[PDB]
Every structure is written in structure tokens, then in C-alpha cells.
Amino acid sequence: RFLKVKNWETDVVLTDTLHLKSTLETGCTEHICMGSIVLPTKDQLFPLAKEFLDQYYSSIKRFGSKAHMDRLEEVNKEIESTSTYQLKDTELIYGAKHAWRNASRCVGRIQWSKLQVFDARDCTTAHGMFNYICNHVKYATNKGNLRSAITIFPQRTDGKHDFRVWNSQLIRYAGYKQPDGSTLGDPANVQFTEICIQQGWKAPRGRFDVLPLLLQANGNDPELFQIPPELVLEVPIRHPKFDWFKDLGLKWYGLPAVSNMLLEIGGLEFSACPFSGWYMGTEIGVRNYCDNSRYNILEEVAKKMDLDMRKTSSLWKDQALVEINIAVLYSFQSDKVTIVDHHSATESFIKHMENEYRCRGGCPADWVWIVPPMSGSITPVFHQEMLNYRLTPSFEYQPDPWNTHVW
Amino acid sequence: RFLKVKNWETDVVLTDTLHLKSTLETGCTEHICMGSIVLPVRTKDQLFPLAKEFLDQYYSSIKRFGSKAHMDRLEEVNKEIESTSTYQLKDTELIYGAKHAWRNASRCVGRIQWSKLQVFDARDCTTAHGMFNYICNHVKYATNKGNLRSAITIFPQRTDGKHDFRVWNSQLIRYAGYKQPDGSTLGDPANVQFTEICIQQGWKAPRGRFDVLPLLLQANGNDPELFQIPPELVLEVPIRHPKFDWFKDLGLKWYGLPAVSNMLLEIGGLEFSACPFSGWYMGTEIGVRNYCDNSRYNILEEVAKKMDLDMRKTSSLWKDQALVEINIAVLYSFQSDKVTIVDHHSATESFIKHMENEYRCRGGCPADWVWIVPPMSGSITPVFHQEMLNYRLTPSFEYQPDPWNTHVWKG
Numbered sequence: 001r002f003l004k005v006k007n008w009e010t011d012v013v014l015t016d017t018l019h020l021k022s023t024l025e026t027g028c029t030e031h032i033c034m035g036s037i038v039l040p041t042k043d044q045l046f047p048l049a050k051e052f053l054d055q056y057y058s059s060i061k062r063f064g065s066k067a068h069m070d071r072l073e074e075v076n077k078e079i080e081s082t083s084t085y086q087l088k089d090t091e092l093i094y095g096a097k098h099a100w101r102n103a104s105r106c107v108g109r110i111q112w113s114k115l116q117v118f119d120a121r122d123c124t125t126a127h128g129m130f131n132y133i134c135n136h137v138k139y140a141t142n143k144g145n146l147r148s149a150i151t152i153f154p155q156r157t158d159g160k161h162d163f164r165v166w167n168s169q170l171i172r173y174a175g176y177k178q179p180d181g182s183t184l185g186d187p188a189n190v191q192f193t194e195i196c197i198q199q200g201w202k203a204p205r206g207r208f209d210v211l212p213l214l215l216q217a218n219g220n221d222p223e224l225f226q227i228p229p230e231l232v233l234e235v236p237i238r239h240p241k242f243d244w245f246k247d248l249g250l251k252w253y254g255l256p257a258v259s260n261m262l263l264e265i266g267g268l269e270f271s272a273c274p275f276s277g278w279y280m281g282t283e284i285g286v287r288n289y290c291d292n293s294r295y296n297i298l299e300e301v302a303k304k305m306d307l308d309m310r311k312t313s314s315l316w317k318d319q320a321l322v323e324i325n326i327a328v329l330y331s332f333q334s335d336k337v338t339i340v341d342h343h344s345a346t347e348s349f350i351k352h353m354e355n356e357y358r359c360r361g362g363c364p365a366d367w368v369w370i371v372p373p374m375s376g377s378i379t380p381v382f383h384q385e386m387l388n389y390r391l392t393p394s395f396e397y398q399p400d401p402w403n404t405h406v407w
Numbered sequence: 408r409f410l411k412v413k414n415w416e417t418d419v420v421l422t423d424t425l426h427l428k429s430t431l432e433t434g435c436t437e438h439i440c441m442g443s444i445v446l447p448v449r450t451k452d453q454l455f456p457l458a459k460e461f462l463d464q465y466y467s468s469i470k471r472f473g474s475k476a477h478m479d480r481l482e483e484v485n486k487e488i489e490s491t492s493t494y495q496l497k498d499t500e501l502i503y504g505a506k507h508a509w510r511n512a513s514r515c516v517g518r519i520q521w522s523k524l525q526v527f528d529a530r531d532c533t534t535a536h537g538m539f540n541y542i543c544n545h546v547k548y549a550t551n552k553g554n555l556r557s558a559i560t561i562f563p564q565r566t567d568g569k570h571d572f573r574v575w576n577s578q579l580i581r582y583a584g585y586k587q588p589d590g591s592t593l594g595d596p597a598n599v600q601f602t603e604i605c606i607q608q609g610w611k612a613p614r615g616r617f618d619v620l621p622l623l624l625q626a627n628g629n630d631p632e633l634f635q636i637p638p639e640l641v642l643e644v645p646i647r648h649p650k651f652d653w654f655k656d657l658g659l660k661w662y663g664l665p666a667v668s669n670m671l672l673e674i675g676g677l678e679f680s681a682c683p684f685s686g687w688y689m690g691t692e693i694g695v696r697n698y699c700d701n702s703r704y705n706i707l708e709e710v711a712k713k714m715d716l717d718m719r720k721t722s723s724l725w726k727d728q729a730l731v732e733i734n735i736a737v738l739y740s741f742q743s744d745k746v747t748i749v750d751h752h753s754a755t756e757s758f759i760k761h762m763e764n765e766y767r768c769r770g771g772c773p774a775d776w777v778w779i780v781p782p783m784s785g786s787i788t789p790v791f792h793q794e795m796l797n798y799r800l801t802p803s804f805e806y807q808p809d810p811w812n813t814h815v816w817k818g
């Protein structure tokens with residue numbers, strides 16, 4: 001009921017009490033751990049609202065106050081009357097900051113309280129959404145000195161008037177199946193690209209084509225918009241010692257902006273809530289560039305490097321991996337675009353985790369996602385026991401809208 | 408019920424039914440996942456059910472379920488339990504049991520090899536001197552002059568818990584660690600406490616960087632005794648690098664035989680508290696963990712210094728660069744000396760093949776992703792993108808506390 005986590009490198013032991021406030025299910029049982037699985041009415045709404053408002057009023061040290069009770073009654077009356085309720089601006093900002101605070105898969109949470117929240121609950125059309133998103137993109141990008149932000153569109157009502165950004169991220173590259181059988185561009189985005197084409201997008205059919213936004217307002221059919229090219233900060237990739245590296249023709253965008261998740265605050269559901277921070281280098285250099293099902297460049301790089309690729313035990317893959325990741329960081333740094341390396345990011349997270357244990361009684365964390373996808377054990381998170389559990393407010397997975405939507 | 412796992416690189420989806428045979432608990436609940444927590448005297452009543460479950464599994468495996476021999480064996484074991492409170496495994500059941508504990512070991516990436524285990528039955532052993540002899544034979548057999556062979560030696564099972572056989576070493580072969588008065592450590596910091604015990608017990612420590620520890624062996628609940636493994640039986644590999652000539656002057660070496668000696672083997676409810684087992688190394692165990700952990704030999708700085716990497720900022724990835732070179736050195740040195748070793752790409756590729764085979768033929772393969780994914784270059788191995796289900800099957804290997812914490816000293 002009170003739980004210990006140990007760091008096996010430093011022998012430091014921390015006590016988690018926060019997990020007692022956990023709410024949703026993990027997918028694990030006493031018989032089986034699903035720790036590595038990626039995806040494991042009025043009546044229910046009021047308890048959800050109360051749980052949230054209690055934590056809000058507690059955070060501003062006015063728990064059990066008249067303003068606390070009065071707000072609880074107000075929301076209760078509004079739910080009884082309208083079947084939903086509206087968050088105060090202050091509650092919206094608090095909720096969004098805490099959904100990030102509670103994101104157990106995010107290594108970057110030391111930043112959680114600095115989030116800029118853009119209230120877009122007055123948005124009514126896909127054109128309005130496009131405007132709000134361009135403004136987010138420009139604010140967050142900030143000419144390369146990136147600032148974390150979320151833009152929050154109107155909440156779900158009857159679930160047939162949902163706001164959705166159909167893209168997985170605000171900025172991502174198109175993927176295309178070739179007559180060859182190969183894939184051009186990013187294979188992760190093949191399905192989305194075809195939907196864009198079928199909705200009328202004129203595709204350049206290149207390796208790095210920024211996708212258009214496909215925006216859905218008020219449950220209407222989604223519309224296409226091109227983000228002003230000048231708002232999309234991109235970085236050409238070069239290496240500080242290998243001059244041939246630039247000839248691979250690689251680039252990536254500076255702004256990681258997740259746009260397919262659902263923000264739940266106080267039982268209310270924000271189905272369009274694009275949010276952004278800045279990259280950890282491995283996300284580009286390890287995942288985006290080296291996953292077999294992504295740009296899959298390891299072979300080409302190793303070849304240019306003149307490595308012995310006859311045997312796995314020469315560690316040619318591992319050598320090329322490091323060099324690709326060196327180049328990502330170098331390129332971002334030279335262009336003054338915010339980026340963090342995995343050593344720095346994980347050190348920061350351990351510091352954050354100790355803060356959270358000390359001031360909050362715990363910090364839900366998913367080791368499988370927190371440990372970087374390269375050089376795991378030489379980062380301080382590897383030896384850190386973590387407890388994974390679900391707190392609200394939260395960011396949740398949601399199905400792709402093209403399965404859900406009826407045209 | 409059917410449970411699905413997906414591979415996110417290939418989209419291949421497997422279905423697990425084996426989890427239905429799971430019994431022991433995980434540490435997890437619907438409210439908390441303890442997937443990254445390292446650690447999350449029986450009655451007759453509890454014992455016969457464990458026995459029956461085991462023997463039903465054994466007899467099914469040999470295509471003799473419900474046969475006269477199956478029923479006769481159940482009857483024989485039942486009667487043995489009622490009159491003696493325990494029972495003895497037949498040699499065939501022991502072999503099967505030990506093989507299955509390995510097959511069921513969810514943290515083991517090397518399980519493709521599970522059916523090839525050499526089982527040494529040491530259940531006739533009575534003294535620490537007897538244990539020493541058995542352990543030397545195991546070492547010599549498993550080493551096989553570098554052509555390593557997997558093996559387990561099984562000492563008498565627990566009776567009342569007052570007469571346990573224990574190997575006090577964590578591994579049969581490991582290097583001493585010495586805490587200096589200035590707070591630094593000589594040799595391996597993982598073994599400081601056990602080294603101190605050995606010394607207190609009368610070991611004359613050479614006090615160098617790579618001193619093979621003596622065996623500390625407890626037979627039949629008696630106080631443990633010290634023995635030195637004959638040095639000619641301890642195969643070691645000097646570490647050098649194929650291109651960097653100065654790497655040898657770091658003075659590094661490692662032993663070839665990884666042999667876990669502190670775990671408990673449970674078969675059919677019986678508890679084998681001394682069951683040392685060995686295979687061969689995956690290179691990253693030495694190159695990543697043993698050499699580069701900050702609380703182990705911690706060599707990353709010295710190596711990167713010698714490579715003249717820019718060490719003023721972590722974002723040059725100097726640590727990652729030195730890490731790869733060290734791991735290249737380990738594999739190169741082992742291969743050059745013809746001592747069995749497996750790289751993490753080969754080992755993980757083999758594991759995924761093993762795993763898919765297990766799903767097909769067995770209905771599943773319990774696996775602990777946290778341990779299976781190698782400690783460097785995680786996502787460029789095929790296990791990273793593989794969903795896994797972790798659950799506990801018996802026969803099994805289990806953690807047991809270090810014996811100096813529990814031992815009642817005779818004097």
C-alpha cells in the first residue's frame with residue numbers, strides 16, 4: 001500500500017504514496033504483466049468533476065472553503081441541468097498542466113509547469129482550427145527557441161460533434177507506395193497520406209513532403225489546409241566530421257507536436273488538443289531514421305562509413321547508430337534549434353522524479369518508454385525502478401477518426 | 408481466453424493461451440504495474456497439488472498422460488508425501504524440471520538453448536567438500552576449453568529449512584571487490600560485501616583488480632567452508648580491440664563462464680536451494696554492464712579519454728561512442744581466443760525465432776521486456792518492438808535472499 005522504488009546504481013530508495021490516488025486500469029493483473037503492451041452520462045460525470053475540483057482547490061490551498069463548496073454546487077447544478085459543464089480558465093490551465101505531469105511515458109516532465117495553454121474552446125469551424133494551429137506552431141517554434149504549448153479545442157458533447165485533428169502530429173512527412181514495391185518518404189504515414197490524396201491533396205511525391213492538416217470541426221467532414229511553409233522550421237542533417245553525410249539528403253522538422261490524443265479533465269473530454277515540446281535527439285536519430293519500418297537508413301550509413309557488414313558482431317549497426325545520432329544533435333545545435341540529448345534528458349527526469357517523490361509523494365513512470373532506445377544502461381533511468389499507474393487529468397490514446405467517422 | 412501480442416516493426420500478431428497455466432503472482436495489480444521492480448518449509452496440504460500439477464505436465468510431455476505409469480507415480484508420490492512429508496524426483500523428472508525452469512525463465516534471452524542443458528544430479532552430495540568436487544566438475548565440463556556447454560548441478564532439496572545446501576557466491580566465478588580507506592574500490596564493486604565475508608572466513612586476499620573469489624559452500628545447513636577453484640579450470644580472456652592497440656594496456660580481462668549460483672529451483676513444489684547453472688555470455692553483459700555501469704568497473708571515462716573524444720558535453724555522445732568500442736573489444740577478444748560468446752543482435756534475433764516457435768508449439772512464451780531488451784542499441788534489435796507478456800510458470804528459478812542474512816551460525 002506504501003511502495004518502495006530503488007535505484008540500483010545509487011542505492012537510493014523512495015516511497016510512493018501517490019499511487020493510492022490512482023484511478024484508471026493498467027491492463028496488468030496479479031497473474032500477468034502487460035507492461036510492454038503499447039495499447040492495453042450524468043451519473044458518472046459528477047464524481048469525475050468532484051474528484052478534479054477537490055484536487056484543484058487543494059492545489060490553491062482553499063480546500064473545503066466556501067468558494068470550493070460553491071463551485072462544486074455550481075458544477076453539479078450545471079450537470080443536472082445541461083448534462084455537461086464548462087471549466088473555468090484557471091481549471092483548464094491547471095488540468096492541462098497536470099495531464100502532462102501525469103504522462104507516465106514522458107521523460108520531459110521536469111518542464112510540466114511551464115506549459116503555455118491556448119484556449120480554443122470558442123472555435124467553431126475547421127478554418128478557425130487552422131488559424132489556431134498556425135498560431136500554436138509559430139508560438140511554439142519561436143524561431144528555434146522552442147516553447148512548450150497546447151491548444152485546446154471544444155470538448156466532446158454527444159460524441160457526434162467531435163473536434164479532431166486527423167494528423168498524428170501537426171508536422172509529419174508523407175509516405176507513398178511505389179510501383180517498385182518500396183516506400184518513398186515516411187512509411188508510418190502511408191494510410192494518412194492516401195486519405196489526404198483521396199480528399200484532394202496534390203502530393204509532390206517526394207521523400208520529405210510536409211503533410212497538410214486534415215481538420216474536423218463539430219463532427220463535420222474534415223477539411224484540408226497547408227501549413228504556411230515559412231512556419232515549418234526544418235533542419236538539414238550533417239555530421240561534424242563526415243563530409244559525405246549531407247549527401248544522404250536527410251532533414252527533419254524542429255517541432256514535435258502530438259495531435260491525435262484525448263485530454264481528459266474532470267470527466268470532460270477534449271478530443272482535439274494538439275501539444276508540442278522539443279525533441280530528444282534519439283527520437284529522430286534512432287526511431288525515425290533507423291527503425292526498419294521508418295526511414296531505415298542504417299545500411300546506407302554503414303556503407304558510406306566503410307564498416308564490415310559481413311557479421312553482426314563487428315557492431316557495424318551500433319557504430320552507424322551513434323554517428324547518425326551525433327549528426328542529429330550537431331545539426332540542431334548548429335542551427336540553434338532546441339534539442340536535448342538522451343543523457344541530459346534522463347538526468348533531468350531523475351531530478352524531476354526525486355522532486356515529485358519529495359513534494360507530491362510519487363511520479364508515475366513507464367520504464368519501457370522512459371529508457372531511451374539506445375545506450376539504455378549508461379543513462380541514469382535504466383537502474384531506476386519506476387511504478388506505473390494512471391492519474392487524471394490525463395492524455396489518452398484514441399482511435400484514428402477515419403475508422404470512427406461516417407461521411 | 409486469448410491474449411494478443413503485436414510486433415510494431417513487422418505487424419505480426421501472436422496469440423497467447425499459455426498464460427492460463429500461470430500460478431504464482433507478478434507483483435502487478437489492475438491499479439499498479441510493477442514491471443520494472445527487480446524483486447516485486449512447506450505443508451503436505453500445499454505439496455501434493457504442486458506435485459500432481461508437475462507430474463501431470465511431465466507425463467503429458469512424454470505422451471503418457473493418464474497411463475498406468477502416470478497413475479502409479481501419482482500414487483507413489485502421494486504415499487511418500489503422507490509418510491515422509493516430502494518426496495524424491497526420478498532422474499527423468501529432475502532433468503525435465505530443470506530444463507523447464509530455464510524454458511520458463513522470463514528474463515532469459517538465451518532460451519532458444521533450453522532443451523540442450525546438461526544436468527548433473529548432485530542429490531547424493533553430503534558435505535561442502537563434496538559440493539566443491541561437483542562444482543569443479545561442472546566448471547570443467549561447461550568450459551570445455553572454450554567451447555562452452557550449458558549445465559546445471561543440482562544439490563539436495565530443502566527439507567525443514569534448517570539443513571539447506573547453499574552456494575554463498577552469487578556466481579561460481581566472479582572477481583573480488585575491495586573498499587579502500589579513501590573510499591575508492593579495487594576490483595569489482597558488486598562483490599565488496601561477499602569479499603569481506605570470504606576474508607572474515609580466512610581467505611587470504613591477493614587484493615588485485617581481477618582476483619577470482621573462493622567458493623563459500625554450505626552443506627546440510629552447516630556453516631559454509633572456503634575452497635579455491637583450481638586456477639587451471641578458470642578460463643579467462645584478456646580484452647583487446649581490433650584497431651586500438653592501447654586498449655590492451657587498460658589491463659582488462661573477463662572470465663568466460665557465467666554461472667549463476669544464488670537462485671532457487673522449484674520443481675513440483677520441491678525447493679533446490681543450491682542449483683548452480685551456467686551458459687555463455689552475451690557480449691553486452693561484460694561490455695555494457697560489467698565494464699560500464701557506474702557502480703561496476705566504470706571504465707567509460709578512461710576509454711573515451713584514450714579515444715580523445717570531446718568530453719566537455721554529453722551531446723557529443725562520447726559515452727555512446729566509447730561504449731560501442733568497448734563492446735567491439737569484448738566480442739573481438741572472445742572470438743579471437745575461441746571462447747563462446749554471442750552478440751546482442753544475434754541473441755535477440757534468435758530469441759524472437761524461439762518466441763514465435765513457443766507461441767506455435769506451446770501457446771506462449773513468458774518474457775520480461777525490461778530484461779530481454781539489451782542494455783545498449785535497444786531499438787535496433789528485434790526485441791524492442793516486440794510486445795511480450797510476463798507471467799510465472801513452474802518449474803521456475805526464483806530469487807532467494809543472500810544466505811549471510813538468514814544463516815544460523817553453529818560456531
Ligand code: HEM
Nearest residue numbers: 100103105106107108111148149275276277278279280395
Ligand atoms: C518539452 C520537451 C519534451 C520532451 C523532451 C519530451 C519527451 C518525450 C519522449 C521522448 C516521449 C516518448 C517518445 C516516443 O516514444 O514517441 C514522450 C512521450 C509523451 N509525452 Fe513528452 N516530451 C516533451 C514535452 C511534452 C509535452 C509539452 C507534453 C504534453 C503537454 C507531453 C506529453 C507526452 C505524452 C502524452 C507522451 C506519450 C505519448 C504517446 O503515448 O504516444 N510531452 N515525451
Ligand code: HEM
Nearest residue numbers: 509512514515516517520557558684685686687688689804
Ligand atoms: C546459454 C546461453 C545463455 C545466454 C546468452 C543467456 C543470456 C541471459 C541474459 C543476458 C540474462 C540477463 C542477465 C543479466 O543481464 O544480468 C539472462 C538471465 C537469466 N537466465 Fe540466461 N542465458 C543463457 C543460459 C541460461 C541457462 C543455462 C539458464 C539456466 C539453466 C539461464 C537462466 C536464466 C535466468 C533464471 C535468468 C534471470 C536471472 C536473474 O533474475 O538474476 N540462462 N540470461
Ligand SMILES: Cc1cc(N)nc(CCc2cncc(CCc3cc(C)cc(N)n3)c2)c1
Nearest residue numbers: 038256257258275276277278279280283397
Ligand atoms: C499506437 C500508438 C500508441 C500510443 N500511445 N502512441 C503512439 C504514438 C507514439 C509516438 C510516435 N512518435 C512520436 C511521438 C511523440 C513523442 C514526443 C511528443 C512530444 C510532445 C515531445 C517529444 N519530444 N516527443 C509519439 C502510437
Ligand SMILES: Cc1cc(N)nc(CCc2cncc(CCc3cc(C)cc(N)n3)c2)c1
Nearest residue numbers: 445665666667684685686687688689692806
Ligand atoms: C537483486 C537481484 C535480483 C535478481 N533476480 N537477480 C540479480 C542478479 C542479476 C544478474 C547479475 N549479473 C549477472 C547475471 C547472470 C546472467 C546470465 C546467466 C547465465 C546462465 C548466462 C548468461 N549469459 N547470463 C545475473 C540481482
Ligand SMILES: C[C@H](O)[C@H](O)[C@H]1CNc2nc(N)[nH]c(=O)c2N1
Nearest residue numbers: 008382383384385443444777778
Ligand atoms: C530498475 C530496472 O528494472 C533494473 O535496473 C533492471 C532493468 N533491466 C535489466 N535487464 C537486465 N538484463 N539486467 C538487469 O540487471 C536489469 N536491471
Ligand SMILES: C[C@H](O)[C@H](O)[C@H]1CNc2nc(N)[nH]c(=O)c2N1
Nearest residue numbers: 036037038368369791792793794
Ligand atoms: C512493444 C514495445 O512496448 C514497443 O515497441 C515500445 C517499446 N518502448 C517504446 N518507448 C518509446 N519511448 N517509444 C516507443 O514507441 C516504444 N515502443
Ligand SMILES: [Cl-]
Nearest residue numbers: 286287373786
Ligand atoms: Cl524506436
Ligand SMILES: [Cl-]
Nearest residue numbers: 287291415786
Ligand atoms: Cl518506435
Ligand SMILES: [Cl-]
Nearest residue numbers: 377695696782
Ligand atoms: Cl547493465
Ligand SMILES: [Cl-]
Nearest residue numbers: 008377696700
Ligand atoms: Cl545491471
Ligand SMILES: [Zn+2]
Nearest residue numbers: 028033435440
Ligand atoms: Zn505490469
Ligand SMILES: [Zn+2]
Nearest residue numbers: 287291786792
Ligand atoms: Zn521504434
Ligand SMILES: [Zn+2]
Nearest residue numbers: 377383696700
Ligand atoms: Zn547495469
